[PDB]
Amino acid sequence: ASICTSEEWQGLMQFTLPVRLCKEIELFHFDIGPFENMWPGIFVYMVHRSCGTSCFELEKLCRFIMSVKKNYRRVPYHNWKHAVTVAHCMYAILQNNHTLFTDLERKGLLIACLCHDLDHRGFSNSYLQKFDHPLAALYSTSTMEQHHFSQTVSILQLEGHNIFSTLSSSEYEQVLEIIRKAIIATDLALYFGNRKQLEEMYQTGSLNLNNQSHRDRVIGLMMTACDLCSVTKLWPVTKLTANDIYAEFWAEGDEMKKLGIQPIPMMDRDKKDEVPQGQLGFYNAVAIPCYTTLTQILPPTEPLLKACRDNLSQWEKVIRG
Ligand SMILES: c1cc2ncc3ccsc3c2cn1
Ligand SMILES: [Mg+2]
Numbered sequence: 633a634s635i636c637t638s639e640e641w642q643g644l645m646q647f648t649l650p651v652r653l654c655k656e657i658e659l660f661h662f663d664i665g666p667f668e669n670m671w672p673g674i675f676v677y678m679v680h681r682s683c684g685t686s687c688f689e690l691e692k693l694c695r696f697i698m699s700v701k702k703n704y705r706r707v708p709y710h711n712w713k714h715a716v717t718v719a720h721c722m723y724a725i726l727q728n729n730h731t732l733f734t735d736l737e738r739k740g741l742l743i744a745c746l747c748h749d750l751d752h753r754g755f756s757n758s759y760l761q762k763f764d765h766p767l768a769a770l771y772s773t774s775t776m777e778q779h780h781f782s783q784t785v786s787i788l789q790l791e792g793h794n795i796f797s798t799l800s801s802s803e804y805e806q807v808l809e810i811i812r813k814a815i816i817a818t819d820l821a822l823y824f825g826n827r828k829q830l831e832e833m834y835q836t837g838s839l840n841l842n843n844q845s846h847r848d849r850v851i852g853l854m855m856t857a858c859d860l861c862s863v864t865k866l867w868p869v870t871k872l873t874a875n876d877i878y879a880e881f882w883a884e885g886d887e888m889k890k891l892g893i894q895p896i897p898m899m900d901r902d903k904k905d906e907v908p909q910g911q912l913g914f915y916n917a918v919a920i921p922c923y924t925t926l927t928q929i930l931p932p933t934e935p936l937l938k939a940c941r942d943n944l945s946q947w948e949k950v951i952r953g
């Protein structure tokens with residue numbers, strides 16, 4: 633784990649967010665893309681708005697964030713920008729559903745969203761497992777996601793970073809278990825089971841947010857909705873993020889080609905024409921069901937389902953030349 637220099641974390645404490653942005657940040661379709669220098673600060677703003685201006689030591693929160701930012705790599709998609717996009721979509725969800733969640737959950741989730749793809753190397757779980765990478769050794773299933781939570785704990789545990797230390801001991805364990813579970817749920821592989829279970833609970837009318845296991849599933853889906861929120865932005869933001877996503881896919885493909893292995897068409901840059909159909913399969917099979925389940929469960933999240941439906945209708949218009 634890398635530590636942020638003293639110069640970095642102090643600049644953030646001073647940061648004041650344009651009052652004209654405070655209005656936009658509250659919207660689901662909000663895009664953070666055009667605001668790079670203000671990401672660390674927009675996240676602090678989000679923390680304070682959601683869990684109070686006295687959630688954490690500001691000196692610690694700022695240390696933590698800048699060090700988190702530092703342990704995200706410069707790969708094309710799974711980078712610092714993505715971590716913050718996911719945190720924002722979660723803030724937007726938390727904000728619209730505030731009391732359904734405890735104060736320890738809100739702070740748990742915001743941080744897990746920031747921390748969720750920490751130290752990503754731009755390679756899928758499959759890859760690492762297929763070619764027996766040390767990380768596949770260390771972690772059998774949900775490989776990257778386990779490493780991310782490893783990193784989350786290994787930052788929390790740096791001199792003066794532990795924004796949770798003033799929690800009671802039963803609250804500290806409690807909060808780190810939200811974090812663990814939320815992160816693990818960003819393993820898309822686990823999402824389809826989760827989604828499927830929750831759907832039933834709903835239809836039956838036997839879904840029960842008091843019941844912990846149910847809550848843990850609802851949080852699971854929230855994490856997936858958040859991880860995928862590229863697809864709920866305005867068409868040109870969506871098109872542009874998709875570019876960065878595939879840039880990473882292709883660069884994973886490139887190493888498999890290099891290795892005399894043919895990559896799936898998703899990770900093969902010489903199969904660009906299949907992307908519009910690739911997208912249309914992902915949206916039908918994954919995103920739509922996701923936001924469709926999230927909106928039955930937490931109805932304020934409608935405009936996420938609405939936006940995704942809009943961008944689906946758009947990939948269609950690219951299939952027709
Ligand atoms: C946004 C768009 C996407 N399009 C395709 C695929 C495929 C795997 S994750 C993913 C994806 C994730 N976020
Ligand atoms: Mg991930």
Ligand SMILES: [Zn+2]
Pocket residue numbers: 714718748749818859
């Ligand atoms: Zn992610």
